[PDB]
Write an enzyme that holds these catalytic residues in place. Structure first.
Site, PDB file in Angstrom:
ATOM      1  CB  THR A 155      -5.409   1.446   3.709  1.00 17.04           C
ATOM      2  OG1 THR A 155      -5.379   0.059   4.048  1.00 17.04           O
ATOM      3  CG2 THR A 155      -4.217   2.194   4.281  1.00 17.04           C
TER       4      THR A 155
ATOM      5  CD  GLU B 260      -3.226  -1.025   1.756  1.00 18.34           C
ATOM      6  OE1 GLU B 260      -3.177  -0.699   2.950  1.00 18.34           O
ATOM      7  OE2 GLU B 260      -4.290  -1.203   1.098  1.00 18.34           O
TER       8      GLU B 260
HETATM    9 ZN   LIG Z   1      -4.212  -2.787   6.298  1.00 20.02          ZN
END
Ligand SMILES: [Zn+2]
Length: 257
Positions: free
Chosen positions: A195, A103
């Site tokens: 997220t 991410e």
């Molecule tokens: Zn996560």
């Protein structure tokens, strides 16, 4: 009905979760040259010796390894943090290929996966209250690269067959999360968000500089999980990562020179 598909993935989340376009969204790209060394940042204190893992769950987006967070058993303190943050769960994000999956990125580099150890601030009493506060959570992010196996991951890998589909859980006692930490605790830190939906802006992110290595066989096993329930059409649980979001009015700080 959010997910990671063409029709429900990150670019769609804002319709149900307008905070998706907010001022402190995660993940971000960590530009190493522009991060500022902050000599007054303290070493992290990771105190995991009394951790009590309980269960592993496929929630349809990832798998969570859950801990007993009803006492100060596995806590994070220090670094940028004020007070005590209790470990509630960890999970990963990963790719369909070794060249993607993380991410956060580092100078635009993507890792094969990213581990998130999620902790909540004890001053707020429970996780649900903590996520409503700007200093409610502390998430320790650790990059995974493919190379040598990580012995301390294997117990996780081995149970995945028992939680292949959404909603399945298995007992998962006596797992030591210290086995997932790199040698160094040097880190970057910035204020951000969950997220995944609900994308709440409650997280102090602590992203470790040093990746851990896992084997190609270990990451392959992650990619055999399913997003779907048993008896639903099979869709492999891969590419369950949100891409980098705009930094906006934030500065990333480094604990190291
Ligand atoms: Zn996560």
């Amino acid at each position: 009905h959010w997910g990671y598909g063409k029709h429900n993935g990150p670019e769609h989340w804002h319709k149900d979760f307008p905070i998706a376009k907010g001022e402190r969204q995660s993940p971000v790209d960590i530009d190493t040259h522009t991060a500022k060394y902050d000599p007054s940042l303290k070493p992290l204190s990771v105190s995991y010796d009394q951790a009590t893992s309980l269960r592993i769950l496929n929630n349809g987006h990832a798998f969570n390894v859950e801990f007993d967070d009803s006492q100060d058993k596995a806590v994070l303190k220090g670094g940028p943090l004020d007070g005590t943050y209790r470990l509630i769960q960890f999970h990963f994000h990963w790719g369909s290929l070794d060249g993607q999956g993380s991410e956060h990125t580092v100078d635009k580099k993507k890792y094969a996966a990213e581990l998130h150890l999620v902790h909540w601030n004890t001053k707020y009493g429970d996780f649900g209250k903590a996520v409503q506060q700007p200093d409610g959570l502390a998430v320790l992010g650790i990059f995974l690269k493919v190379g040598s196996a990580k012995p301390g991951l294997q117990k996780v890998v081995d149970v995945l067959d028992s939680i292949k589909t959404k909603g399945k859980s298995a007992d998962f006692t006596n797992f030591d999360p210290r086995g997932l930490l790199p040698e160094s605790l040097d880190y970057w830190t910035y204020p951000g968000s969950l997220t995944t939906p609900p994308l709440l802006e409650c997280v102090t992110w602590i992203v470790l500089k040093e990746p851990i290595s896992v084997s190609s066989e270990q990451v392959l096993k992650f990619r055999k999980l399913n997003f779907n329930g048993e008896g639903e059409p099979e869709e492999l649980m891969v590419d369950n990562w949100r891409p980098a979001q705009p930094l906006k009015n934030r500065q990333i700080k480094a604990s190291f020179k």
